[PDB]
Amino acid sequence: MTRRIRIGGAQMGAISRSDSKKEIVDRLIALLRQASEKGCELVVFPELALSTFFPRWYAERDGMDGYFEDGMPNAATLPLFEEARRLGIGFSLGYAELVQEDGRVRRFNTTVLVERNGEIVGKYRKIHLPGHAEYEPERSHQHLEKRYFEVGNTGFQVWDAFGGRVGMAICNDRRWVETYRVMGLQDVELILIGYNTPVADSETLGMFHNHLTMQAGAYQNSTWVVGVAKAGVEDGHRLMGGSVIVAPTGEIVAQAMTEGDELIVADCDLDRCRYYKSHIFNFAAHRRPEFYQRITSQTGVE
Template sequence: MSKTIKVGLVQQSNQAKVEANIEKLIQNIESCAREGAQLVVLQELHNSLYFCQTEDTDVFDLAETIPGPSTERFGELARRLGIVLVTSLFERRAPGIYHNTAVVFEKDGSIAGKYRKMHIPDDPAYYEKFYFTPGDMGFKPIDTSVGRLGVLVCWDQWYPEAARLMAMAGADMLIYPTAIGWESSDADDEKQRQKDAWVISQRGHAVANGLPVISVNRVGHEPDPSGQTNGIQFWGNSFVAGPQGEFLTQAGNQEEQNLLVDVDLARSENVRRIWPFFRDRRIDAFSGLTQRFLD
């Protein structure tokens, strides 16, 4: 039996004006809904520029409580359009405690659940540890009317353990709102290797877990406010992979684009029957995974 849902992905470029970004998001979400999308997924930190290129205490003013203004606005949009919506917000939890948080809205506008980004990078132009406290909610799928969503965020996508734990908890699909790109000083061949590694890693999660993977990245150039680098050219390439890692749809790396694709969630059952990776896992020999390193 097929259980097919239509998924919309919004790959967007952003500017400094938050309201302009949100208005464009709303238009793109509405466009996906008109095309029949039942589930719409947005990119990481979609309300603003990717502010982690520098460390600036004033940026914390962008953060919001959950519930708060953005959850009210996007929740009402989900209700009006009758869609499940995956958003990515800068959460103010308490003074001095902020999270990079994905919020999922049910089609009635209610908050179905949220996920706080667990793995926090700290690299040149990606100074996220300055802003975000690591998540403390674990790897738990969010139940919605379109299925159990294994929502993770960006840097989480490099960790097979995160994908596996979501799958083991019963996720029907893995979803990655993302903000990743190139520093312009990198050579072209290095840029290609970086993008290919990003794609391969997530397709690998699809294969290893027998699940569809939805990855939504931002696109366009965002300057470095400090002027220390040439900024980030976000590489887009948002895509959906099926449970054998096959591309179901893929965007380009230069343009804003809305993708719509049918995803058959029931196909995972058939794939897991012919590739029974879960059956053959040697859980008796995996205790070392809870250690930092095996000396």
């Protein structure tokens, strides 16, 4: 390996409504410390890793602000940032962002990327909000992400970090090909994706579709993909596991074995992204955007 970075996928178990924030942060620090002991330079945390998956509960549009983060970091999450800064490990962390922008209060489903020196690299805000906005009793479970979050205003950004090109996406972003391709057009080499995927109380098909989208996005953009889950049963609601680290070949090189707090580790050579980028997936030599206009013109079918 010529540009190797040891990545830890920090899958989390269930977070309940009755769990305090300190109990949640301590679980993150414990996963952070295990990655340190095994030599990881980057640990990937799930989507909304600082609270239970509250979009499953119905309340006022402002009634979930208790699960949001007033600042990043704040008094509750500072012990995680300082422990990571002491050990020299960067991390990506999903959380519910409460922010004051252009006059009003704004809410985003957000992931922050932090460098080994403790400096915040960048911030991705979720673009594809799934579920619904109003109460729908016809559903077996509510998924009210469109009620508590706004569409992010960052776009699929790619930063110079960890010696390469690092991008971020959140949850159901990973089943849209535009997610990987937009960052692939920014020469991305590592895509970090935390997720919370609800699952019925057979089940291989859901896991098959989960890995299929990430393995294809990795290969077809010749980039590493890290998908870190928040799994388990949260107050009767089951969340999908199967956290993986995917090579730019589409191969799974690390996979979670449990549905609780679990670290997966892989040595990831960023230079392995280079081969397909010069030949089979040489974008500048092969792509013909004059035939792709429907992708950026319309939303539905015609």
